[PDB]
Design an enzyme around this catalytic site. Structure first.
Site, mmCIF file in Angstrom:
data_model
loop_
_atom_site.group_PDB
_atom_site.id
_atom_site.type_symbol
_atom_site.label_atom_id
_atom_site.label_comp_id
_atom_site.label_asym_id
_atom_site.label_seq_id
_atom_site.Cartn_x
_atom_site.Cartn_y
_atom_site.Cartn_z
ATOM 1 N N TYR A 1 -3.555 2.940 -12.275
ATOM 2 C CA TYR A 1 -3.725 4.358 -11.914
ATOM 3 C C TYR A 1 -3.899 5.176 -13.188
ATOM 4 O O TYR A 1 -3.372 6.285 -13.302
ATOM 5 C CB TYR A 1 -2.534 4.851 -11.074
ATOM 6 C CG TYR A 1 -2.436 4.063 -9.801
ATOM 7 C CD1 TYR A 1 -3.433 4.163 -8.816
ATOM 8 C CD2 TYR A 1 -1.355 3.230 -9.575
ATOM 9 C CE1 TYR A 1 -3.378 3.436 -7.623
ATOM 10 C CE2 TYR A 1 -1.304 2.478 -8.422
ATOM 11 C CZ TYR A 1 -2.286 2.596 -7.453
ATOM 12 O OH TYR A 1 -2.151 1.822 -6.325
ATOM 13 N N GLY B 1 0.954 0.268 -6.621
ATOM 14 C CA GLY B 1 0.995 1.282 -5.566
ATOM 15 C C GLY B 1 1.945 0.989 -4.406
ATOM 16 O O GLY B 1 1.661 1.409 -3.291
ATOM 17 N N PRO B 2 3.121 0.353 -4.659
ATOM 18 C CA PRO B 2 3.988 -0.034 -3.531
ATOM 19 C C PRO B 2 4.608 1.152 -2.810
ATOM 20 O O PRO B 2 5.035 1.017 -1.690
ATOM 21 C CB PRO B 2 5.052 -0.916 -4.202
ATOM 22 C CG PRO B 2 5.150 -0.341 -5.599
ATOM 23 C CD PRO B 2 3.694 -0.041 -5.956
ATOM 24 N N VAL B 3 4.697 2.283 -3.480
ATOM 25 C CA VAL B 3 5.242 3.493 -2.852
ATOM 26 C C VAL B 3 4.108 4.444 -2.468
ATOM 27 O O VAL B 3 4.328 5.652 -2.194
ATOM 28 C CB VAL B 3 6.357 4.104 -3.768
ATOM 29 C CG1 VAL B 3 7.105 5.183 -3.056
ATOM 30 C CG2 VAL B 3 7.359 2.988 -4.133
ATOM 31 N N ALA B 4 2.873 3.914 -2.484
ATOM 32 C CA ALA B 4 1.709 4.712 -2.137
ATOM 33 C C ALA B 4 1.642 6.014 -2.936
ATOM 34 O O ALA B 4 1.371 7.094 -2.384
ATOM 35 C CB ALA B 4 1.622 4.951 -0.584
ATOM 36 N N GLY C 1 3.747 7.929 -4.207
ATOM 37 C CA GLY C 1 4.702 8.931 -3.772
ATOM 38 C C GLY C 1 4.684 9.276 -2.303
ATOM 39 O O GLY C 1 5.591 10.002 -1.818
ATOM 40 N N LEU C 2 3.741 8.736 -1.541
ATOM 41 C CA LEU C 2 3.722 9.093 -0.129
ATOM 42 C C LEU C 2 4.862 8.391 0.636
ATOM 43 O O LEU C 2 5.209 8.826 1.743
ATOM 44 C CB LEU C 2 2.356 8.821 0.511
ATOM 45 C CG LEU C 2 1.229 9.703 0.023
ATOM 46 C CD1 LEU C 2 0.020 9.186 0.701
ATOM 47 C CD2 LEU C 2 1.485 11.162 0.390
ATOM 48 N N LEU C 3 5.441 7.329 0.073
ATOM 49 C CA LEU C 3 6.596 6.672 0.697
ATOM 50 C C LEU C 3 7.893 6.945 -0.074
ATOM 51 O O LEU C 3 8.661 6.051 -0.349
ATOM 52 C CB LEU C 3 6.330 5.172 0.773
ATOM 53 C CG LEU C 3 5.173 4.690 1.679
ATOM 54 C CD1 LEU C 3 4.724 3.274 1.391
ATOM 55 C CD2 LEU C 3 5.543 4.858 3.178
#
Ligand SMILES: OC[C@H]1O[C@@](CO)(O[C@H]2O[C@H](CO)[C@@H](O)[C@H](O)[C@H]2O)[C@@H](O)[C@@H]1O
Ligand code: NA
Length: 288
Positions: free
Chosen positions: A52, A188-191, A193-195
């Site tokens: 990212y 991206g495991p937490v998307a 910050g969306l998760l």
């Protein structure tokens, strides 16, 4: 209390949480302070490649490795696009010089396409591996056509993929990857910050989720674990996943990621509830 998983069929046993993507900053002393704390937490897998659009400062990581390099698994990646053998072999020399070490544990191809010179690329990695400049190689890709080519034709041990509850597109490919003895490294495991605890920005979606569907899903997912922990444990519940590179902007955030990864694994009721509640999209592009 940090567990490890074998990376593919390699001899690399990586911590279930890996470290990457930080502006360790401008001050060497504080950067070395950050790294000492990362390693103290039992993280042994450092990926210096951009995730990212943020990587790790190789000069600072090199100085942090001093006296303990044998106990750390170091990953890097491979301005003028030049897709040749010579380029792949020369690029790793630069990282080695900055890192002040003489081998890389895992050397990873970014930006691969099926139109690349695939035999030349594989040969470059195999020659570096035979010479001991690298121990193993892998790719970073969400293109099934690239993935299938390297699984069939090469000895990659790992594929880095974006993967979370909200992006389950990788799962289609897990049986094939696992049958080849290869592991997934998760970004991206937490998307992004969306998760987590951050607000869902109003009106905005994520992949094939609309805003209202993200809201409904946050609310319908199990609530007996914090969402951030549910997200990391969902990734880890898949045997193909060797490690997760969760984003962090502070030592406190690294510590939060460590605590979440060290929590109890998902059961069956938990993993099934999540599979049923969340969308299961597939890649549309680059399938063949
Ligand atoms: O629409 C059919 C079918 O597609 C899914 C896939 O998850 O939802 C997609 O389509 C909806 C209608 O166009 C969108 O509102 C939604 O954002 C999108 O993911 C299913 O939920 C639906 O049954
Ligand atoms: Na399939």
């Amino acid at each position: 209390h940090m567990k490890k998983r074998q990376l593919g069929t390699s001899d690399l046993h990586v911590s279930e949480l890996g470290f990457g993507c930080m502006s360790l900053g401008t001050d060497e002393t504080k950067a070395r302070r950050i790294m000492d704390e990362v390693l103290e937490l039992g993280i042994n897998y450092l990926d210096t490649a951009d995730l990212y659009n943020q990587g790790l400062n190789e000069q600072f990581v090199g100085k942090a490795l001093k006296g303990r390099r044998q106990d750390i698994i170091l990953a890097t990646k491979v301005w003028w696009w030049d897709p040749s053998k010579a380029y792949i072999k020369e690029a790793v020399k630069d990282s080695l010089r900055r890192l002040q070490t003489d081998y890389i544990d895992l050397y990873q191809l970014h930006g691969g396409t099926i139109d690349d010179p695939i035999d030349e690329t594989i040969e470059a990695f195999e020659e570096l591996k035979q010479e001991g400049v690298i121990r193993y190689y892998g790719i970073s890709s969400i293109r099934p056509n690239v993935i299938k080519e390297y699984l069939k034709r090469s000895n990659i041990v790992s594929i880095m993929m974006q993967y979370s509850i909200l992006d389950r597109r990788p799962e289609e490919w897990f049986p094939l990857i696992q049958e080849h003895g290869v592991s997934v490294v998760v970004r991206g495991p937490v998307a992004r910050g969306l998760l987590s605890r951050r607000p869902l920005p109003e009106g905005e979606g994520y992949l094939n989720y609309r805003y209202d569907e993200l809201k409904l899903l946050r609310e319908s997912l199990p609530t007996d674990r914090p969402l951030h922990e549910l997200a990391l444990q969902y990734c880890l519940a898949h045997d193909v996943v060797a490690t997760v590179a969760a984003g962090a902007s502070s030592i406190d955030q690294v510590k939060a990621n460590v605590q979440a990864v060290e929590a109890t694994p998902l059961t069956a009721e938990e993993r099934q509830h999540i599979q049923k509640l969340a969308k299961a999209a597939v890649y549309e592009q680059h399938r063949e």
